[PDB]
Amino acid sequence: LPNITILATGGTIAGGGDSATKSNYTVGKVGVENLVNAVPQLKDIANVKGEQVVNIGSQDMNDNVWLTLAKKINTDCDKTDGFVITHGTDTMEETAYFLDLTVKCDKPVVMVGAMRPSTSMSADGPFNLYNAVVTAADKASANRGVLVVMNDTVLDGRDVTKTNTTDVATFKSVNYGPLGYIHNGKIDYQRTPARKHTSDTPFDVSKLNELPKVGIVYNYANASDLPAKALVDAGYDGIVSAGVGNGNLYKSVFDTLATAAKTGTAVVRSSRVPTGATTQDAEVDDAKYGFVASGTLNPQKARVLLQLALTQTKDPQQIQQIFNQY
Amino acid sequence: LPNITILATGGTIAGGGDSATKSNYTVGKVGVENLVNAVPQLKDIANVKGEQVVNIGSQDMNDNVWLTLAKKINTDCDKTDGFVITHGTDTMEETAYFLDLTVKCDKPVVMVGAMRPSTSMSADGPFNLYNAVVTAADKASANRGVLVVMNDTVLDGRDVTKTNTTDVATFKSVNYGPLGYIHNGKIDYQRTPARKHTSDTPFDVSKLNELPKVGIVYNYANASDLPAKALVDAGYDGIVSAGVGNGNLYKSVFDTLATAAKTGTAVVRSSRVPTGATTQDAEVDDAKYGFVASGTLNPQKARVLLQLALTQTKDPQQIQQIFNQY
Amino acid sequence: LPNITILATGGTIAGGGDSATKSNYTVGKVGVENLVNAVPQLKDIANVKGEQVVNIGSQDMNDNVWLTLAKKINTDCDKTDGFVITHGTDTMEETAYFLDLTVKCDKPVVMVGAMRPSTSMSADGPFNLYNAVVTAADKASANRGVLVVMNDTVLDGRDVTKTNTTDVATFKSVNYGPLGYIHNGKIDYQRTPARKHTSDTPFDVSKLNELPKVGIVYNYANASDLPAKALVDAGYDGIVSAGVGNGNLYKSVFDTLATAAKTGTAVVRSSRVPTGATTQDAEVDDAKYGFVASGTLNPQKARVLLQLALTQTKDPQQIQQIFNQY
Amino acid sequence: LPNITILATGGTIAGGGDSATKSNYTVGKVGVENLVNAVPQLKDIANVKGEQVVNIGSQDMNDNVWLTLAKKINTDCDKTDGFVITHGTDTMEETAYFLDLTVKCDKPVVMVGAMRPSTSMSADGPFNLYNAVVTAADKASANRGVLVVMNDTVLDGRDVTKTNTTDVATFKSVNYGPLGYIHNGKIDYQRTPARKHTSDTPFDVSKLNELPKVGIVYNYANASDLPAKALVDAGYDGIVSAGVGNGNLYKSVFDTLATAAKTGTAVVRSSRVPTGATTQDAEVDDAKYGFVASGTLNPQKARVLLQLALTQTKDPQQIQQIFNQY
């Protein structure tokens, strides 16, 4: 049977409450060993090894953890046939894209979580974890980038996002769709991401202990420019605007970001709107102000790419080209 | 024929570019008179009167404009059979909910926009504006709250949101669905909002010249607490958190907001996730910290209700009850 | 505690396979007693009584079982506080609409099923059944018509349909949305159906032992008229066309159904397209041919309303009026 | 400038009504010359040549028109840089898949239609046709199989389906998503279909003047087996069942099709449910009965693949293999 390493970070898949039917719980309390032992069927499909990396709610995910995960995967690539990462669902879409750009291992890297705690009635985590190991053990899963497996579906790390606060079926690749569906332990793959990922990117975090500082500001009617000003005064390397509509900015925020771009802060226009691209050639003249349009990357994913872009260059033209290729 | 007043505020429905096939344009450049004259079919269904209120891109929408629109509608209620408001699509979902809570006129108030500029090939604005007048003239539309008409569909002001950056079909009521569909100028209504609206709310802005100051902060992996701190130091009356997952907060932001709530700042937990409710009884003990859970209101709509709540009370228990009724 | 009656009819909720991880299974093998004893927490929210009506896969649902169910609910209405019906998911949407038009009981009637068999890892039936009893016990559920509770959502019997062959989240009300969402045993209801239902219809099956015969034919490129002809030659009372697009018919099928409508067969145009209404006033002059347009009813739901209309009248004008009101 | 050939077949894109605001219209009345002259901007992006093949509503599409189209494209492949086919939207999804399996030309083949007639206010056909020519002229479009361009989106011919009866946004690839989105004349392609298409299939219709006869029967509660029986008695080569749920059949229809599969009729199980695969290994033992499971092909698309498979083989094992590869 294939050797599959489970790297555990916490999340509701490792969460517990006092009652099967009350909704209150805490995430990241159950160890990886107890996750594995609770699905004895794993032993028939894989030779499983579990490692606890951290045990937190992914609302508390941070750069230190990202860096650790990428180096761990790249270091151990040759010692296993695939990886499964258990993780909270709240920022899974961020971690998954970060690894999609920095992992240099060609073997399957599959992330998995649960929307209901392990103690819940009809808990979704056991069958998710099962399907994640199936996916990581399948030869067809290699070379597709970092993957997220939830609710019988295989999604790519770039497009996948959380679309509902509570539904087990919340994860969807809302612009370009999923890669495959799983039924009876077999995967019907009909798609693979076209944008460059993993060993095909120039991003290498093997020697880094810190990432550039990138913040996000939200736009809405009568938006305060105070959040944007605070990031600039604190010397942030980049700002991502969660803009309204097609990446548009409220007047005061636009003014602050235009000034910031001229003094060297990288600025990316994204959108609070959940689907579709923030494009060039709409209402904002990006070339005039030195802004970058994020394309289909939502604000939190645009932050991930901008941080990595900032380790290579500070030129907006160059950053735009990166946003057009990854 | 019925008397319908069009109150124009700008938007891409009044926007223009230099080419039918290039995507570049400016919003809010065409006067209301030219909008009306460009759809001569209006004259067969309604006695139309146009008034220009402002002419801006709704990315620049603000409290002054909201206040003006509500008082204008309430003042002129008895002089017309219905209202149509033309407006940019980027913040239409905010304005529509603000009017939904403050308009005291029982006659139909219908908002309408366009995703493609008036100069575009296959411009959607002419047929939208036609259907909006149809909806405002229909007796069945009364008493349903403020309405948004886009792409042959009648949506309620509370649930409606922009779901795509560029698609003509972008507006959807993503939690509870639309009220009606329009075909051949007739409306099949099968739903009406249950939450209290218009003349059934206690919100009255007739004597107000200013609203309480409410800002929004975004959460993501490694989120900065600097945006939250800046709002607090500037003495904001309320903050809305666009949280991850089911309204969760990154550790540093949670710390700052908990401290702020104890010194009197109203705090509401919402979610960057586009559908579903931010609930109580999940991972955050709202009663312990004095926080309010926003339910299905997304961050920008939760700001609208919080501002109005703050003109009546500062008690979190009371504000939670308001979030449970409106 | 409320008294709740569970009427069991079979389905995958009562289905079983030989392995927790293989997909093969048979439906309708587990008795109602075992279903209930498997969810001990029901006894905290209701006094439950189980009755086995039949035990089948709902792909074999038929008129005799529908008539039995309606009569049994109407007869026992005053002996209980609410009903839950366990049922397969394949024709759940048909039965729910049939009961929505023939149940004269004012108490909540809630249907529930499961997409995974009871022996499956992460089986969804136990939490669905728990939620269905919560909904049947909730006073706010009354007077909303017959309801389907699946995946934490409360759906009305008219609009609900199965949208995916295998997903636990397959049930959606795809035209007008759900009525309510359940979280921690509490239901946020924001909608109720406007079309008339249960006690407000004129359909009474108390004295009927059979229903009018109504069959469905499908349209596609180069469609055979043989299926249509076979139903007319057999003397069917009505035929529903699952048309292409907005209820259109392939030419040979058109000719056959136009002739049948003239010699007295009732003909309803519906559509194989999963959302949106089949309307009047498009490419087919229904008035000339005596055809009825089904509005948002899909073919299998149109068949339900046509059968019941045919117990009251055979006039196409009157039938159109029924399709406009229920 | 590229040379692009438009092959016109009719449809609402070529449809006309008496009023810009009434919904009534007839399809297939405007000639190709008038379609092209109505979009003068085409001459800036391509050298266009129009040919009228037929002029019908696509509800009357048939095998003879399919065979004509495939042969005409394969014959003229080397005389042009790309093809656009104008077509009604009702069976667009059928024709596109048929051409996807039989076109041996490597150049882009793009289908396009309109949901509103050309005389309608805000008619969508002109911008769709413009975008379809842009797509056919783009080098990046080649080798992606046959494409459907509607509402600024590029969809593959296998997964695309009509999801709504009247919405301009009705076309979606509901299982695996779209290939690309068009903005300002530029296409962001992120996906290509994995299933084999065009020159990589063994289907060759160059010498055929008819196709095997394959009909479709629908399942629902109390379904009549008469439609199935009529097609068997008439000697049909194959029957596709639009099954309930995951390809299930009402008992009488099951018995009839199991008997037909034994006396040589090819039987494919598909589903009336609009998304998801009909799988093996659920409730029906296909191997015992000689049935084929259609996977994500819906009934009208399964009929297309079954007809073409039947020109190569009659063995159900081989046919299953074809359904697994194309």
Ligand SMILES: N[C@@H](CC(=O)O)C(=O)O
């Ligand atoms: N708050 C949890 C949510 C979950 O895992 O579902 C987390 O992200 O860790």
Ligand SMILES: N[C@@H](CC(=O)O)C(=O)O
């Ligand atoms: N930026 C424009 C977008 C639109 O109207 O579509 C506005 O909101 O005014």
Ligand SMILES: N[C@@H](CC(=O)O)C(=O)O
């Ligand atoms: N064939 C099963 C499917 C299910 O229940 O999910 C049934 O309808 O009875």
Ligand SMILES: N[C@@H](CC(=O)O)C(=O)O
């Ligand atoms: N019946 C018309 C519908 C359309 O084109 O939109 C056709 O398919 O030809």
